[PDB]
Design a binder for this molecule. Structure first.
Ligand SMILES: Nc1ncnc2c1ncn2[C@@H]1O[C@H](COP(=O)(O)OP(=O)(O)OP(=O)(O)O)[C@@H](O)[C@H]1O
Ligand SMILES: Nc1ncnc2c1ncn2[C@@H]1O[C@H](COP(=O)(O)OP(=O)(O)OP(=O)(O)O)[C@@H](O)[C@H]1O
Ligand SMILES: [Mg+2]
Ligand SMILES: [Mg+2]
Ligand SMILES: [Zn+2]
Ligand SMILES: [Zn+2]
Lengths: 396, 396
């Protein structure tokens, strides 16, 4: 089946980057006449079920061009790669898609792919795309310049994104007048596009088992309970008890960074992760992103990175998986500070311990402001620039 | 012979799930007009003699449709599979049944089955069913989406279920006025539907050997002794001595989980296993079922899982087969906690040992409450929601 950008919801930022590829594929001549050089390969990274293959298919749908694809789980391998690239050259504008590239990047198959990437002319209108959910185990040879040197991140949907996906999959189904798609969206935090599609099918089965010809609000609410438990369960959602712990963790980062003189501005607070760092990806990039290395700005960065872990210990006396990654990142930052700013393992241990104590004292103070932010975050699920600026000014 | 749902006892939950299949088979048009998608295959799992084939036959009995079946123990194989599916297509609504699928899922026969599953149209009213008692040795290719993606569990009967099965097989037999079917049910813990059917035949043989024309209560009691011992024995039952050990094991889980702050609520206690986890099945599912991973809730889960093993050691100084599986599951949970929460084998060993000591101290205390629950469990064999809530409130 053919799909376009109208079948995708909650991927505005990813779709923005992919518009240039469609323009290049529709008319390569406009890029060549001014010496604009397009990348040879593009990589999509994200959690399973977020719609990476759907975006690749929609890109080919928007620009009416052929679509040659292969899957890395099916891996004779060297000969299959040769056939795919030969077919794409016979048709001037085309797309080559490689799904699950982590399962193949056995040594002979990878070598053939490297030879093919260097052997085709980009000015003919040929692009190569790939997708994976384990970007940190890829062979470093694939990420060198001239081969797969562009990355795009696909994120889980938020409240507004979930409601848009539900409308897409119910546009050809009869619904009653008591169905409220916004209430259903508010009750499925943590779901992805694949879980929402399966939920709609379960609600239709409950109505057909009784011979009715319309889906009611009661069918949707009973479907949620059936997909999260039992011998055949498909989805996981965030319970009210787990939501309080997550709200305190996120609010701890914002409070500490707003107090330290060298802290960075805060633009958004949410219950759902958005950034690639928030998803646990390093992307083969250095941790340091500043031209100058100074002691004062490095200590403030360490203290703000431990704010989420300090809030859990002071309010609950617990520790989660997210707080364990924060302490691991801080330990490697303190290791580079000793060698650049002037027995070694004992010095690194002292730097981390001092910063942790500093963050805890800041949490004990201002404890009234931390509680106020959590209450608002538990009823809206997200606060962003303009509304967040006013809130942060009333407090502090 | 034709059978319906009136010939099945003690399978209410399984029968509830199968009602939708009958409705689909009776009129597929009502499902297609609202875009409801039915599964292609259904799998039945349970211990031998629990009535998996009887349910498959009753499903075809309830909805007057053909019934094409084959057995996996009889396995030319590829040609036999082709014939079965071709026959089912010539008749619009039909059922395809594959018994003992574990004996066939040699490589050519399995490949043909995969091709057939993808080649038929579900909207015509065709469903495929299978059964097995070794679900953990099936080929992973059979459980992928679009082929055998729904599972139903069949459980051994309880006291009330055993009495219903006895009435079904004595409805065409002359009985005396001193026969009490409820007393017979109380004296056969551990029997399945196949054992109860054979018991009724033995009682009739004892009456015919004396020329009588009615079965008495004495015939039933002598039949029990004949089927559990001798050169030709058929059944196994739980003796009074083995019942005390099992009662203490089950009560240990409930006492520990009621004390830990993060423990889960207890809804039912019984001598007969009910869940798929209690039957020793993993079903190819991940052990973790929570969105958030925290240290406090993981330690409480480990302690409550070792409560049954702690009660056996403190009261009897023994260990059973069930307690050996609990320690194996706990070891794999502690292995994922080290990698996610921050020489490795030595750390895993310490986590399990600390939790075991915690459970034993809880058992030593509250030992008076543990004894009280065992006495009630030895005279009713099962306690459930409303009656259990009151009992747990009087204690503790
Ligand atoms: N944003 C979305 N809008 C609408 N449907 C979506 C969206 N994201 C996912 N889906 C649904 O998810 C289904 C499966 O998604 P897709 O095949 O793209 O998975 P994926 O992200 O590649 O997963 P994996 O990592 O497991 O391969 C698609 O059929 C589509 O119906
Ligand atoms: N719930 C029940 N009610 C009545 N009879 C039952 C029940 N369960 C089993 N039986 C009796 O058990 C006999 C054998 O059961 P069945 O053929 O369904 O075995 P099964 O569960 O498929 O066993 P296996 O795993 O050994 O193949 C049936 O003839 C039926 O008389
Ligand atoms: Mg995919
Ligand atoms: Mg059988
Ligand atoms: Zn954090
Ligand atoms: Zn146990």
């Amino acid at each position: 089946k053919r799909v376009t950008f109208k079948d995708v919801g909650g991927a505005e930022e990813a779709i923005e980057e992919l518009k240039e590829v469609v323009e290049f594929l529709k008319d390569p001549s406009k890029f060549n006449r001014i010496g604009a050089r397009m990348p040879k390969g593009i990589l999509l990274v994200g959690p399973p079920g977020t719609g990476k293959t759907l975006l690749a298919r929609a890109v080919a749908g928007e620009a009416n061009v052929p679509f040659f694809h292969i899957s890395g789980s099916d891996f004779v391998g060297a000969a299959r790669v040769r056939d795919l690239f030969a077919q794409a050259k016979a048709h001037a504008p085309s797309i080559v898609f490689i799904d699950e590239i982590d399962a193949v990047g056995r040594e002979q198959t990878l070598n053939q792919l490297l030879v093919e990437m260097d052997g085709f002319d980009s000015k003919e209108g040929i692009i190569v795309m790939a997708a994976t959910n384990r970007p940190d185990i890829l062979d470093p040879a694939l990420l060198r310049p001239g081969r797969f040197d562009k990355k795009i991140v696909v994120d889980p949907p938020d409240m507004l994104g979930r409601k848009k996906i539900l409308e897409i999959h119910t546009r050809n189904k009869p619904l009653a007048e008591d169905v409220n798609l916004e209430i259903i969206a508010k009750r499925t935090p943590g779901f992805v596009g694949a879980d929402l599609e399966n939920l709609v099918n379960e609600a239709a089965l409950l109505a057909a088992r009784e011979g009715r010809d319309k889906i009611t609000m009661k069918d949707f609410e009973e479907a949620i309970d059936r997909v999260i438990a039992g011998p055949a369960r498909k989805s996981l959602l965030i319970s009210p008890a787990e939501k309080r712990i997550i709200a305190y963790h996120e609010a701890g980062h914002a409070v500490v960074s707003t107090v330290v003189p060298n802290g960075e501005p805060v633009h958004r607070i949410s219950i759902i992760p958005r950034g690639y760092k928030a998803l646990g990806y390093t992307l083969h990039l250095p941790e340091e992103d500043k031209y100058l290395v100074s002691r004062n700005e490095l200590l403030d960065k360490l203290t703000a990175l431990l704010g989420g872990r300090a809030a859990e210990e002071v309010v609950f006396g617990d520790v989660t998986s997210g707080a364990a990654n924060d302490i691991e990142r801080a330990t490697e930052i303190a290791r580079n500070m000793v060698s650049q700013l002037g027995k070694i393992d004992e010095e690194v241990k002292k730097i981390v311990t001092n910063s942790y104590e500093r963050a805890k004292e800041i949490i004990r103070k201002y404890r009234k402001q931390l509680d106020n932010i959590v209450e608002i975050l538990l009823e809206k699920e997200t606060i962003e620039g303009d509304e967040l600026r006013r809130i942060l000014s009333e407090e502090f």
